[PDB]
C-alpha cells in the first residue's frame, strides 16, 4: 500500500470480497436434490429461512464430502477475483 | 531443453526487458560488453533531453548481445520479434 | 399508449435469486377485472377476449341483466371445462369474435368424418392436414347467394361450431357438407355458418423481411435499385398522365374493383381540371410516398397473394405445385410469355419458379423453390385463386413455411424468373414448447392472471427490429447463429399467444442503434450502407 | 536529407500519468497530412503534455550530403532505429531499440521508405 | 452544455468517493460538487476505472473542463480527463430559481362557469422542480411519511394561467395548470462509493392514487399557491401555451365530491 488510507481501503475490500465469496458458497450449497422445490420458479414462503440460517450452512458443509467439494470449488472461483486485487493495489517496483 | 536460465537470470532478464526506462551510458555498457561474446550494437538513443550529451544505450539492446547474428526468433504470444540477432519488440508475459 | 414493462411487475433482487415484485397497478388491474366496472345502473362483467384484443390489451365486458347474464352467454358459446390449458382455453373462448356474414343454418345430421393422413419421418410428427376441409358445389352456390358473389371461388375460409379452417371444392362430393378430425377445438351448442373471407387476388408486395432474407442468395443491389427507380418514375408520371392512373389503380389495390375515381381515370378531363379528383390523386401519392418512407413496399405486378389448399389426387410429388391466378391489365396486354400459359381468357396458368413466403420470416430456410407444372387432370377439377399442395411428401409445405397451418392464411406467390434458386437451405424446426395442463378447472382467476401477465415480457415487436438491425450491421446476414437465435425467439414469442412460454429476450441482444429509415428520432441514428440504405437514399433523392 | 517532416499535435497518453516511472506511449495526429502516430517516449527526461505541438523529421543519416551510417544542434530528441514491418493507408513499424513506433498515414505520403533500413528520428517541441 | 454531470475518464482503483470529493473541493470551489458516483462491477468491493460527477452550477462545470483541458488536475499521479455524460445522476434542475420548496399544492377543476375554483385536497410543504431539458415538471408530496412523485409533462398541460390567493389583482400568488391527460404517480421505496450529498439511495416505482379521497384521479387542473415573485413570470413563461393575462379566483368548498370507490371520475347514482 502507498499509505495508511490505501491499506485501510484494501482491508475493507478484502473483507467485503471474503463476505461475497462466503455468500457465493452458501448459494452454491443449495444445488442439491433436497432444494428442487425451492429452486423451481414458483411461490415459496421459506425464502427468509434459507438466508437467516447462516450458522447451519457451515455445519452442513463440514458433514458432507460432495458439499465440501462444491463449497471449495465455489470459494476458489470467487477468490480468484480477490487474488486479482494485488495487481491493482501493488506497485510496479514491488519485488514480490 | 534440459537447462534453463535459473531463478536469478530469469528475474534479471525480466527486469532488463520490462522497465524500458533506464538507459545505460557508454561506460557501463562497455563494462558489461566484456562478458558478452558478441559486439556492441548502435546506441539507438542519441539525445534523451535537450541538454543531455553522452548518448546512451537502451536496456533491450543489452539483452540483444546474447544471440547469434543469424538467429531469428518470433513469439507471437508475448509479441517478441528477434531479427538479425536484435530484439525488436516485447510487451509482457515472460513466457519465452 | 401501451403500458411499459417497468410499470408492471418491476424486478427486484431479494435473497439468492431475483423475484419480480408486483406494483400497485397490477393489483388495480386485477381488481378492475374481478369486481368489474360500474356505470350507472349497470355492472359489466368479463366475458372473453379475442386473439387480436390480447395483443392490444383489450377485453369485452357485458352488463349482467335479469334475462341473460355473462355466465349464460359463456355457457351458450360452449363448454370450456375440457381444456386444461390456461392459454388454450382463453384462445378457444375468444376465437368466436371475428366479423362474419350470417348464412343459413345446418343441423348436425349430415357431417362426415373423413380420416386424415399423417407422416412420421426422422422421428418428427409432420401432419399435412391441419385445417383443410372439403366442400361441394351446391354448398358454395348457397353460401355465395347471400354475399352477392358472382364467381365461385375454389377455396374460402370458414368457421362454425368451434371448427376453424379453409375448405376446398371438389367434383366428386357426396353431400353438402363434410368435416375432418383435426378441426374440433371445443364442443358448442350451435352450428351457425358464417364466412369471413372468400378470395382476394390482390397484387403481391415486397416487405422488409423478404428483401432482407433474399439479399444473401445472390441477388444484387442493381435489380432492386432499378425496380425502385422505375416505380418512382411511374409514380411521378401518374399526376399529369391519365393513362398511367388507371393502370396503377388496376395493379396496386384491387385487381377488379369498381369505383368513381377508377371509372373517371380511364375517361376524364385534364389533371389540371377536376380538383376533386386531382387533389385525391395528390393525397394518394403523398400517402404512398409516406408508406414507402416508413417501410419498404415494392409493387410487383407478376405476383399475387392467395391462400392454398389441397386436392384428393395424390399425383403431385414433393416439389411440384400448381399456380393459377387471374389476368391483370399487364397480363392481358401481353399474354405471350415463356412461364405464362393462357389457359383461359381470365385465368392464366404459371409454369415458372414460384416461391412461398409469409409476413413473419426470420430464417433463411423458408425460401423453398417450387416448380409449377400444368396437368389436364388438375385443370379438370377447376381450381381458381388457390395454389395446390401435394398430399404426399417428406414434410408438408406449410411446415417449411415457418411451421404454419392450412387455416386460411395468405401466401405470397410470384412467377418470377430473375431470382436465384441455386442456393437451398433447410427450414427450422417447427416443434413448439410442451403444453401446460392444470389439475383443476378454471376458476376465472388464472385466466385474469394470464391476461394481465401478457403485457409483462411481451417482446414480440422488438425481436424483428433487432433482427433487422443485426442483419444490416453484420455482413453475411441470416447465416450466423445470432440470426438463428433471434428467429427461435421470434417463433417462441409468436407461440406465446398459444402456449404460456415467455420469449425471455436477453439484454445483450438489444441493438442500441437504429438506421436512417426509422421514426426513432430520439434514439441515435447511424448511416446504413446496406440495400435498404441505398433504397432510402434513392427515395430521399427522388423526393428532393 | 529529410524524408518525412510535418507538425504533430498530441491527442492522448496511454498511461495518463506524471510520475509513473514507466515509458509512455503517445498518440499524435499530424496537421494537414492527417497521419496518426504511435510513439513510446520517456516523460521524466522529455516532458510532453496534452495539447503541445512538436515537429518530427526522419533522415537516413545525420550527416550532410551523404555519409550514411550535423543536425544534432537543431533537434533535441534524436533516436536511431530500423523499419521491420511495412505492410498495412500504409503504416510503418520502426523500433528504436525496443521502443515501437507506428506511423499510419496515406500510401502516397509514405513511398520512399525501404524495408530493413536504418533511419533516425528528429523531434523538437517548438 | 445541456446537462451538468461530467464523466471522469480514468481514476485510481484504490481511491474512495470521499477522497475524490475532497480533491475536487480543494481544486474547485468549496462544496461545489452535488453527486459523485463510482460504478462497481461487484456489489461493494470492485469499483470501475471511471466515475461520474455532478456539479451544482454550470460555471463550475466550465471551470473544471478548462482545468482538465490544460491538464492541471493531478490526483495521485493520474491525469483526470473530463468528458460529457449521457444521463444525470439525479434529475435536479441546474437553475436554483426553478427549485420551489415549501409551497402549497391543491387540486380541483373549473366547477363554476364564472371565475371560481374548487379545492378537493390541499397539500402543504411540497417540492416543485421544473426540468426544461426533460420537458416535465416534478412534484414531491410527503404523505404519511413516504413521499410521492407527481410527474406532469409539457404535452400534458394545454394552457398556463396565473392567479392570486391574497385577493390583490396586481400581485400574482397562484398558477393554473390545465391538464389534458393524467399525471404519473410514483412512490419511494426502501453507500461507500456514493456521496450524493443527501438521502437519494432509493428507487421510484409507479403506483396508483395515494389520496384517501382519490382527489388526484378526479381533478383535471392543478393550482400552485406560491409567494409573489418579481421574476417568477419569466420562469413560468417557459411552459407551452402561456397566456399573458391576469385572472382572479375564489375558493369553493367542494369536499363533498369525494368517492372512495376504484372508479373515481364517475358521478354518484
In angstroms, rounded to a whole number, what is the distance separating the alpha carbons of residues C230 and C373? 31
Q: Which residues of A touch C (CB under 8 A)?
A: 27, 30, 47-48, 50-51
**Could you give the C-alpha distances from E192 to E16, E47, E89, in angstroms and in order?**
7, 11, 16
* Å between E178 CA and nearest CA of chain C: 21
Q: Which of residues 77-106 of E touch D (CB under 8 A)?
A: 77-79, 81
In angstroms, rounded to a whole number, what is the distance separating the alpha carbons of residues D99 and D25? 9
Nearest to E79 by CA among D26, B49, D9: D26
**Could you give the C-alpha distances from C171 to C74, C381, C383, C469, E119, in angstroms and in order?**
40, 6, 10, 50, 78
CB contact at 8 A, C231 and C298:
yes
CB contact at 8 A, E202 and E189:
yes
**Quick check: helix, strand or coil at residue C104?**
strand
Q: Are strands E221-225 and E100-109 parallel, antiparallel or unpaired?
A: antiparallel
Nearest CB among A16, A81, A89 relative to E14 is that of: A89
* Å between E80 CA and nearest CA of chain D: 8
Q: Are strands E82-84 and D100-104 parallel, antiparallel or unpaired?
A: unpaired
Q: What is the DSSP letter of E260?
A: -
In angstroms, rounded to a whole number, what is the distance separating the alpha carbons of residues D40 and D23? 6
Reading phi first (left if > 0) and then psi (alpha if -120 to 50, else beta), residue B94 is in left
Nearest CB among D22, D98, D116 relative to B58 is that of: D98
Q: Is the dihedral of CA E48, E193, E82, C521 positive or negative?
A: positive
CB contact at 8 A, C131 and C372:
no
- The Cβ-side half-sphere exposure at E263, using a 13 Å CA radius, reads 14
Q: What is the DSSP letter of B18?
A: H
Resolution, rounded to a tenth of an Å? Answer: 3.1
Cα separation of the two ends of chain A: 13
In angstroms, rounded to a whole number, what is the distance separating the alpha carbons of residues D69 and C324? 85
Closest residue of chain A to C19, computed from CA coordinates = A41
Tell me how many residue pairs between chain A and chain D have CB atoms under 8 A apart.
3
Nearest to A2 by CA among D116, E13, E262, C13: E13
Cβ partners under 8 Å of residue C64, min gap 6: C42, C43, C45, C70
Q: Does E208 touch chain C (CB under 8 A)?
A: yes
Q: Are strands C320-321 and C369-372 parallel, antiparallel or unpaired?
A: parallel
Cβ partners under 8 Å of residue D14, min gap 6: D24, D25, D26, D27
**Could you give the C-alpha distances from C137 to C90, C112, C147, C325, E70, in angstroms and in order?**
35, 16, 16, 20, 90
Which residues are paired to C179 by β-bridges? none
**Which residues in chain E are closer than 8 Å to D49, comparing Cβ atoms?**
71
Integer-rounded Cα radius of gyration of chain A: 18
All three cell numbers of C136, joined, read 361441394
Tell me which of D17, D43, D49 to substitute to probe the interface with E (most E C-beta atoms closer than 10 Å): D17
- C409 carries a ligand binding annotation: yes
CB contact at 8 A, E147 and E140:
yes
Nearest CB among E19, E42, E76 relative to A20 is that of: E42
- Method for structure elucidation: cryo-EM
In angstroms, rounded to a whole number, what is the distance separating the alpha carbons of residues C187 and C163? 9
Cα separation of the two ends of chain B: 13
Cα separation of the two ends of chain E: 56
All three cell numbers of A81, joined, read 477475483
Reading phi first (left if > 0) and then psi (alpha if -120 to 50, else beta), residue C72 is in alpha
Nearest CB among C6, C28, C37 relative to E208 is that of: C28
Provide the residue range defining the domain that includes D44. Answer: 4-126
In angstroms, rounded to a whole number, what is the distance separating the alpha carbons of residues D77 and E201? 54
Q: Which residues of B touch D (CB under 8 A)?
A: 17, 19-21, 41-50, 52, 57-61, 81, 83, 87-90
Across chain E, how many H-helices and E-strands are there? 3, 15
- The Cβ-side half-sphere exposure at C112, using a 13 Å CA radius, reads 15
Question: Domain tally for chain D?
Answer: 1
Tell me which of D75, D92, D97 to substitute to probe the interface with B (most B C-beta atoms closer than 10 Å): D97
Q: Cβ–Cβ of B46/D72 closer than 8 Å?
A: yes
Q: Does D13 touch chain E (CB under 8 A)?
A: yes
Quick one: which H or E segment has residue C319?
Answer: none
Q: What phi and psi values does residue C310 have, to the nearest 5 degrees?
A: -135, 155
CB contact at 8 A, E178 and E157:
yes
All three cell numbers of B46, joined, read 542519441
**Quick check: helix, strand or coil at residue B15?**
helix
**Which residues in chain A are closer than 8 Å to E42, comparing Cβ atoms?**
17, 20, 81
All three cell numbers of C371, joined, read 416448380
In angstroms, rounded to a whole number, what is the distance separating the alpha carbons of residues C203 and C214? 19
Q: Cβ–Cβ of D22/A92 closer than 8 Å?
A: yes
CB contact at 8 A, E25 and E31:
yes
**Quick check: helix, strand or coil at residue D8?**
strand
- C416 carries a ligand binding annotation: no
Across chain A, how many H-helices and E-strands are there? 6, 0
In angstroms, rounded to a whole number, what is the distance separating the alpha carbons of residues E46 and A78? 13
In angstroms, rounded to a whole number, what is the distance separating the alpha carbons of residues C167 and C137? 12
Q: Cβ–Cβ of A27/C14 closer than 8 Å?
A: no
Cβ partners under 8 Å of residue E15, min gap 6: A9, E75, E76
Torsion on CA atoms C501, C507, C513, C514, rounded to nearest 10: 10
Q: Cβ–Cβ of E263/C23 closer than 8 Å?
A: no
Examine chains A and C and say if they touch (3+ CB pairs below 8 A): yes
- C311 carries a ligand binding annotation: no
- The Cβ-side half-sphere exposure at C136, using a 13 Å CA radius, reads 13
Q: What phi and psi values does residue C442 have, to the nearest 5 degrees?
A: -75, 130
Nearest to C327 by CA among C385, C407, C389: C385
CB contact at 8 A, C295 and C286:
no
CB contact at 8 A, B23 and B48:
yes
Residues A20-35: b if buried by 16+ CB within 10 A, e if exposed: bbbebbbebbbeeeee
All three cell numbers of C68, joined, read 341473460
All three cell numbers of D68, joined, read 550514411
Tell me which of E16, E21, E22, E45 to substitute to probe the interface with A (most A C-beta atoms closer than 10 Å): E45
**Which residues in chain A are closer than 8 Å to C19, comparing Cβ atoms?**
47
Q: Please provide the DSSP assignment of C116-173 as one string.
A: --EEEETTEEEES-SSEEEE-HHHHHHHHHTTT--S--SEEEEEETTEEEEEEE-SS-
CB contact at 8 A, A64 and A72:
no
**Mapped to the 3 state alphabet, what secondary structure does C496-511 carry?**
CCCCCCCCCCCCCCCC
Residue in this structure with the C-alpha cell 476505472, named with its chain if needed: E49
Residue in this structure with the C-alpha cell 353460401, named with its chain if needed: C143
Chains in contact with D, counting 3 or more C-beta pairs less than 8 Å apart as contact: A, B, E
- The Cβ-side half-sphere exposure at C534, using a 13 Å CA radius, reads 14
Instruction: Give CB contacts under 8 A, 24+ apart, made by C522-531.
Output: C528/C472, C530/C215, C530/C471, C530/C472, C531/C211, C531/C215, C531/C221, C531/C224
**Quick check: helix, strand or coil at residue C457?**
coil
Amino acid at each position: 500500500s502507498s499509505d495508511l488510507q490505501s491499506r485501510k481501503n484494501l482491508t475493507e475490500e478484502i473483507s467485503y470480497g471474503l463476505r461475497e465469496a462466503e455468500q457465493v458458497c452458501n448459494k452454491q450449497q443449495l444445488m442439491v436434490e433436497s432444494w428442487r422445490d425451492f429452486l423451481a420458479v414458483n411461490g415459496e414462503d421459506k425464502e427468509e429461512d434459507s438466508v437467516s440460517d447462516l450458522a447451519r450452512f457451515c455445519y452442513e458443509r463440514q458433514k458432507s464430502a460432495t458439499l465440501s467439494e462444491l463449497a471449495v470449488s465455489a470459494f476458489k472461483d470467487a477468490y480468484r477475483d480477490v487474488q486479482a486485487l494485488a495487481y491493482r493495489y501493488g506497485d510496479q517496483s514491488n519485488s514480490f | 531443453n534440459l537447462l534453463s536460465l535459473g531463478q536469478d537470470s530469469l528475474t534479471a532478464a525480466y527486469l532488463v526487458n520490462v522497465e524500458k526506462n533506464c538507459y545505460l551510458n557508454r561506460a557501463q555498457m562497455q563494462q558489461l560488453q566484456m562478458y558478452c561474446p558478441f559486439q556492441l550494437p548502435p546506441p539507438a538513443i542519441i539525445k534523451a533531453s535537450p541538454s543531455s550529451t553522452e548518448p546512451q544505450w537502451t536496456g533491450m539492446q543489452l539483452f540483444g548481445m546474447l544471440f547469434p547474428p543469424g538467429f531469428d526468433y518470433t513469439y507471437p504470444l508475448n509479441n517478441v520479434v528477434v531479427s538479425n540477432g536484435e530484439l525488436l519488440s516485447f510487451s509482457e508475459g515472460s513466457a519465452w | 399508449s401501451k403500458l411499459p414493462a417497468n410499470a408492471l411487475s418491476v424486478n427486484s433482487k431479494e435473497g439468492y435469486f431475483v423475484k419480480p415484485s408486483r406494483t400497485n397497478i397490477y393489483n388495480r388491474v386485477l381488481s378492475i377485472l374481478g369486481e368489474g366496472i360500474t356505470v350507472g345502473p349497470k355492472r359489466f362483467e368479463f366475458l372473453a377476449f379475442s386473439a387480436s384484443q390480447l395483443r392490444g390489451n383489450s377485453v369485452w365486458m357485458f352488463a349482467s341483466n335479469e334475462k341473460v347474464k355473462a355466465e349464460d352467454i359463456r355457457e351458450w358459446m360452449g363448454c370450456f371445462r375440457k381444456i386444461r390449458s390456461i392459454s388454450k382455453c382463453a384462445a378457444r373462448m375468444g376465437q368466436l369474435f371475428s366479423a362474419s356474414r350470417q348464412t343459413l343454418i345446418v343441423r348436425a345430421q349430415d357431417v362426415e368424418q373423413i380420416p386424415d393422413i399423417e407422416v412420421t419421418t426422422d422421428g418428427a410428427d409432420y401432419c399435412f392436414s391441419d385445417g383443410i376441409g372439403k366442400i361441394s358445389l351446391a354448398f358454395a352456390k348457397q353460401v355465395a347467394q347471400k354475399c352477392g358473389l358472382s364467381h365461385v371461388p375454389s377455396a374460402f375460409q370458414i368457421r362454425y361450431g368451434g371448427y376453424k379452417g379453409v375448405i376446398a371444392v371438389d367434383r366428386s362430393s357426396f353431400r353438402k357438407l363434410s368435416l375432418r378430425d383435426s378441426m374440433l377445438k371445443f364442443d358448442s351448442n350451435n352450428r351457425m355458418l358464417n364466412v369471413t373471407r372468400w378470395t382476394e387476388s390482390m397484387p403481391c408486395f415486397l416487405n422488409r423481411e423478404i428483401i432482407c432474407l433474399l439479399s444473401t442468395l445472390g441477388i444484387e443491389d442493381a435489380m432492386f435499385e432499378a425496380m425502385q427507380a422505375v416505380h418512382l418514375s411511374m409514380l411521378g408520371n401518374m399526376l399529369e398522365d391519365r393513362d398511367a392512373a388507371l393502370n396503377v389503380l388496376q395493379k396496386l389495390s384491387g385487381e377488379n374493383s369498381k369505383n368513381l375515381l377508377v371509372k373517371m381515370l380511364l375517361q376524364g378531363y385534364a389533371p389540371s381540371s377536376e380538383p376533386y379528383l386531382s387533389m385525391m390523386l395528390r393525397v394518394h401519392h403523398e400517402s404512398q410516398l409516406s408508406e414507402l418512407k416508413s417501410r419498404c413496399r415494392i409493387l410487383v405486378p407478376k405476383g399475387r397473394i392467395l391462400i392454398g389448399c389441397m386436392d384428393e389426387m395424390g399425383i403431385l410429388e414433393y416439389g411440384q405445385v400448381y399456380v393459377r391466378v387471374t389476368l391483370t391489365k399487364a397480363e392481358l396486354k401481353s399474354r405471350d410469355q415463356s412461364y405464362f400459359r393462357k389457359i383461359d381468357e381470365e385465368t392464366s396458368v404459371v409454369i415458372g419458379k414460384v416461391v412461398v413466403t409469409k409476413n413473419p420470416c426470420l430464417h433463411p430456410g423458408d425460401i423453398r423453390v417450387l416448380d409449377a407444372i400444368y396437368e389436364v387432370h388438375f385443370e379438370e377439377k377447376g381450381y381458381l385463386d388457390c395454389i395446390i399442395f401435394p398430399q404426399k411428401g417428406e414434410r408438408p409445405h406449410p411446415n417449411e413455411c415457418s411451421g404454419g397451418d392450412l387455416d386460411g392464411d395468405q401466401f405470397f406467390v410470384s412467377w418470377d424468373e430473375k431470382i436465384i434458386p441455386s442456393e437451398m437451405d433447410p427450414p427450422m424446426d417447427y416443434a413448439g414448447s410442451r403444453p401446460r395442463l392444470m389439475d383443476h378447472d378454471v376458476t376465472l382467476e388464472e385466466i385474469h392472471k394470464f391476461f394481465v401477465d401478457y403485457m409483462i415480457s411481451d417482446t414480440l415487436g422488438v425481436i424483428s427490429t433487432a433482427h433487422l438491425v443485426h442483419a444490416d450491421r453484420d455482413p453475411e446476414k441470416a447465416r450466423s447463429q445470432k440470426c438463428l437465435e433471434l428467429a427461435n425467439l421470434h417463433s417462441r414469442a409468436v407461440d406465446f399467444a398459444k402456449t404460456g412460454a415467455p420469449a425471455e429476450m436477453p439484454y445483450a441482444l438489444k441493438p442500441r442503434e437504429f438506421p436512417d429509415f426509422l421514426e426513432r428520432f430520439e434514439k441515435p441514428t447511424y448511416i446504413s450502407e446496406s440495400v435498404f440504405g441505398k433504397l432510402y437514399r434513392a427515395v430521399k433523392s427522388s423526393l428532393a | 536529407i529529410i524524408m518525412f517532416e510535418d507538425i504533430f499535435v498530441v491527442d492522448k497518453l496511454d498511461p495518463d500519468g506524471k510520475k509513473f516511472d514507466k515509458v509512455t506511449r503517445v498518440e499524435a495526429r499530424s496537421h494537414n497530412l492527417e497521419m496518426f502516430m504511435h510513439l513510446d517516449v520517456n516523460t521524466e527526461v522529455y516532458p510532453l503534455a496534452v495539447g503541445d505541438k512538436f515537429t518530427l523529421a526522419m533522415a537516413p543519416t545525420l550527416n550532410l550530403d551523404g555519409t550514411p551510417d550535423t543536425l544534432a544542434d537543431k533537434y533535441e530528441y534524436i533516436m536511431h532505429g530500423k523499419l521491420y514491418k511495412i505492410s498495412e493507408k500504409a503504416e510503418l513499424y520502426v523500433s528504436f531499440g525496443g521502443l515501437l513506433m507506428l506511423l499510419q498515414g496515406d500510401p502516397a505520403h509514405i513511398s520512399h521508405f525501404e524495408l530493413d533500413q536504418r533511419l533516425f528520428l528528429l523531434m523538437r517541441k517548438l | 452544455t445541456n446537462r451538468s454531470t461530467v464523466k471522469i475518464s480514468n481514476v485510481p482503483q484504490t481511491i474512495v468517493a470521499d477522497e475524490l470529493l475532497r480533491f475536487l473541493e480543494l481544486h474547485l470551489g468549496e462544496d461545489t460538487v452535488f453527486a459523485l458516483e463510482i460504478p462497481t462491477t461487484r456489489d461493494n468491493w470492485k469499483p470501475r476505472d471511471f466515475a461520474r460527477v455532478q456539479f451544482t452550477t454550470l460555471e463550475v462545470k466550465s471551470r473544471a473542463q478548462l482545468l482538465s483541458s490544460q491538464s492541471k488536475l493531478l490526483f495521485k499521479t493520474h491525469n483526470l480527463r473530463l468528458s460529457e455524460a449521457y444521463d444525470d445522476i439525479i434529475p435536479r434542475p441546474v437553475d436554483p430559481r426553478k427549485r420551489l420548496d415549501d409551497i402549497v399544492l391543491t387540486v380541483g377543476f373549473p366547477e363554476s362557469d364564472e371565475k371560481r375554483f374548487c379545492a378537493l385536497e390541499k397539500w402543504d410543504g411540497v417540492r416543485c422542480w421544473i426540468l426544461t431539458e426533460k420537458r416535465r415538471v416534478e412534484f414531491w408530496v410527503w404523505e404519511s411519511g413516504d413521499c410521492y412523485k407527481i410527474e406532469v409533462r409539457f404535452e400534458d398541460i394545454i394552457e398556463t394561467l396565473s392567479c392570486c390567493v391574497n385577493g390583490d389583482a396586481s400581485e400574482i400568488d397562484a398558477f393554473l395548470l390545465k391538464l389534458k391527460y393524467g399525471p404519473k404517480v410514483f412512490k419511494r421505496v426502501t453507500d461507500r462509493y456514493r456521496f450524493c450529498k443527501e438521502d437519494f439511495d432509493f428507487m421510484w416505482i409507479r403506483t396508483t392514487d395515494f389520496s384517501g379521497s382519490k382527489s388526484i384521479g378526479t381533478s383535471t387542473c392543478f393550482c400552485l399557491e406560491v409567494h409573489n415573485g418579481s421574476t417568477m413570470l419569466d420562469i413560468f413563461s417557459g411552459l407551452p401555451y402561456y397566456r399573458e393575462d391576469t385572472l382572479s379566483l375564489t375558493y369553493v368548498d367542494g369536499k363533498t365530491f369525494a368517492s372512495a370507490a376504484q372508479i373515481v371520475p364517475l358521478l354518484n347514482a
